[PDB]
Amino acid sequence: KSSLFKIILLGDGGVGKSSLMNRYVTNKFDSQLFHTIGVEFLNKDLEVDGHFVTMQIWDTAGQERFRSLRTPFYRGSDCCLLTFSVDDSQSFQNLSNWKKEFIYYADVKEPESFPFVILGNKTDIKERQVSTEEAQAWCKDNGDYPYFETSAKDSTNVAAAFEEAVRRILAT
Numbered sequence: 074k075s076s077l078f079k080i081i082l083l084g085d086g087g088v089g090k091s092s093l094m095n096r097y098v099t100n101k102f103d104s105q106l107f108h109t110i111g112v113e114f115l116n117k118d119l120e121v122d123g124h125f126v127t128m129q130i131w132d133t134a135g136q137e138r139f140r141s142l143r144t145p146f147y148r149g150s151d152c153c154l155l156t157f158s159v160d161d162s163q164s165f166q167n168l169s170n171w172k173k174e175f176i177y178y179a180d181v182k183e184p185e186s187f188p189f190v191i192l193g194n195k196t197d198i199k200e201r202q203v204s205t206e207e208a209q210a211w212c213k214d215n216g217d218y219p220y221f222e223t224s225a226k227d228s229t230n231v232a233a234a235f236e237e238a239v240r241r242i243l244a245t
């Protein structure tokens with residue numbers, strides 16, 4: 074890694090990737106966001122351990138039709154925020170596919186230990202389709218990844234999630 078910590082968000086369309094980035098960077102939420110087409114990135118600088126970090130967050134299209142727009146920018150990522158929505162079972166069932174897509178196109182230095190952090194977003198929705206138990210189980214079984222239940226809407230665990238991504242990058 075260079076000093077610029079590259080954190081990339083991947084996950085199905087509608088799961089809340091753009092909202093998560095926008096909540097963390099600008100502390101805003103929009104109930105009417107449109108689908109992402111080309112990738113977007115934003116810088117964010119702060120202290121995590123009480124130590125100075127410069128990150129660049131890369132937001133990508135979740136929709137299959139835009140795969141070719143996002144895959145060129147996987148390379149050089151330091152951590153991947155694999156995102157699903159707790160109200161969307163298919164988004165969770167697709168996690169393994171997303172991990173495989175990342176690894177294939179990222180060509181990272183050693184794929185076995187690459188840092189993923191898993192976000193089950195929209196935790197504010199009580200009518201969930203995905204259980205915390207099964208999500209925790211997937212994280213354990215597929216690399217013992219950190220798991221966060223998040224809400225871009227009410228801010229729950231959004232900063233926690235990005236802060237953990239930084240903690241997973243630091244050791245390299």
Ligand SMILES: Nc1nc2c(ncn2[C@@H]2O[C@H](COP(=O)(O)OP(=O)(O)NP(=O)(O)O)[C@@H](O)[C@H]2O)c(=O)[nH]1
Nearest residue numbers: 086087088089090091092104106109135224225226
């Ligand atoms: N209730 C709730 N809605 C959320 C949350 N995060 C995002 N949303 C909503 O879900 C919809 C999709 O959000 P968006 O951030 O655009 O999703 P995306 O993952 O970026 N989609 P794409 O990959 O197609 O760009 C929007 O209507 C947004 O307001 C959340 O935590 N809670």
Ligand SMILES: [Mg+2]
Nearest residue numbers: 090091108109
């Ligand atoms: Mg988006």
